[PDB]
Design a binder for this molecule. Sequence first.
Ligand SMILES: O=P(O)(O)OC[C@H]1O[C@H](OP(=O)(O)OP(=O)(O)O)[C@H](O)[C@@H]1O
Ligand SMILES: O=P(O)(O)OC[C@H]1O[C@H](OP(=O)(O)OP(=O)(O)O)[C@H](O)[C@@H]1O
Ligand SMILES: [Mg+2]
Ligand SMILES: [Mg+2]
Ligand SMILES: [Zn+2]
Ligand SMILES: [Zn+2]
Ligand SMILES: [Zn+2]
Ligand SMILES: [Zn+2]
Ligand SMILES: [Zn+2]
Ligand SMILES: [Zn+2]
Lengths: 218, 222
Amino acid sequence: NTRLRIAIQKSGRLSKESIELLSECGVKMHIHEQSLIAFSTNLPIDILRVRDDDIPGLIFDGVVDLGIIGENVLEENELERQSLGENPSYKLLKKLDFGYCRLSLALPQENKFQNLKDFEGLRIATSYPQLLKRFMKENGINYKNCTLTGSVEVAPRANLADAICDLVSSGATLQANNLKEVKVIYESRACLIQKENALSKEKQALVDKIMLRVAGVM
Amino acid sequence: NTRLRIAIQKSGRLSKESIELLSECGVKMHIHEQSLIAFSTNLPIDILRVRDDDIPGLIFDGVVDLGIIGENVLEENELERQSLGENPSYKLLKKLDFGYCRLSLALPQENKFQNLKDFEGLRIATSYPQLLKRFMKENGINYKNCTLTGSVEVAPRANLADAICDLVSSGATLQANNLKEVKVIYESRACLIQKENALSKEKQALVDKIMLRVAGVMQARE
Ligand SMILES: O=P(O)(O)OC[C@H]1O[C@H](OP(=O)(O)OP(=O)(O)O)[C@H](O)[C@@H]1O
Ligand SMILES: O=P(O)(O)OC[C@H]1O[C@H](OP(=O)(O)OP(=O)(O)O)[C@H](O)[C@@H]1O
Ligand SMILES: [Mg+2]
Ligand SMILES: [Mg+2]
Ligand SMILES: [Zn+2]
Ligand SMILES: [Zn+2]
Ligand SMILES: [Zn+2]
Ligand SMILES: [Zn+2]
Ligand SMILES: [Zn+2]
Ligand SMILES: [Zn+2]
């Protein structure tokens, strides 16, 4: 197999815009329900539709050639890999102009918040435990972890946590759960990344062509 | 919280059978299919319906009191936590009589397989990278990892991997993807576990009561 492998989010925040970037770069393909692999009809390119949390790993492990992924997800998994004693590596090709969001600490609307110190001792629910951990350590604040993959914003109401650390874009989900954003700990946007090890000449040439197109398209 | 917290899978292999064990143990429940939070109507017990991969962590971190989880999922996350330099700990209360499955290596049906050595150099897709890693190390076999959270079985036919390491229950998914099971690396069943730090006397008394009922239920279901 000589086909370039690009991993994108199967469904979620980045899916639509990732597909549109690719088509704007002249990559034609049909996306409809394929469980894992879609095939460009005009170029030797395979689009792997995966859970976003898997994309950093696929790139670090050299399973795919390119990936489109949020900085937050990339950094969370990079930190996890580094904490296991590994050396995750990737090339950053381009910071993209979509997927804008921020990872923030949030409290029940009725809670008094003067200072970050108010998070001392608190149980904090998040899907990004490594990012949360690094931030709290850097700011000298002790807390108790609660790792949930979904429904993080329900954790205070379920009495699993006193607070949360979660992605915010519109702020609608925090509002719906009667929570308030008190401290941004990370700002994110989508990026295009490549695996570390050199591609074949053919593949690198196609990547350079796509990057011109991305640069051009931008 | 005076209420005992039990974490169970929201939806998947163990969800139905975990809810049924609880009702079979006399725990009456109000559930909202889409919701994290469920509660017992006749006992001071909160049922937290979550992704199964989250349950070992909630127990290790003492966020909940009890959890029902597959041994496979528990072991994978225990290894992960230990590999991060942490000290995950839990009490095993009971091995349960549902959630039977095995984590196995599988290859395309048409592949020749003589020996485990045939995995040397191969890209192996899995949702259980620590369990795979430990097994391959202990058998002296080098491989390339591919971590996927879902659709693991399609990785070979998508040319993402040469092989997979995945749970097999009925074998139907492997058959559907024209893959064959060549080596079992772990046998698994659901288990009931408890966080490490001592419960209050009243909570521990409720747990002991539930455990008696669990035993009775299991004998009665044979
Ligand atoms: O501020 P809002 O616009 O209400 O958005 C907030 C939601 O978006 C995030 O999920 P997201 O879909 O980004 O994560 P995922 O795609 O990884 O599930 C986060 O988990 C919130 O639920
Ligand atoms: O042999 P079969 O009966 O076809 O079963 C195989 C399926 O079971 C496992 O999923 P599961 O929901 O157990 O994994 P999870 O823990 O990721 O939810 C595995 O990923 C297969 O998809
Ligand atoms: Mg989403
Ligand atoms: Mg399942
Ligand atoms: Zn089509
Ligand atoms: Zn089509
Ligand atoms: Zn995700
Ligand atoms: Zn109701
Ligand atoms: Zn799962
Ligand atoms: Zn039995």
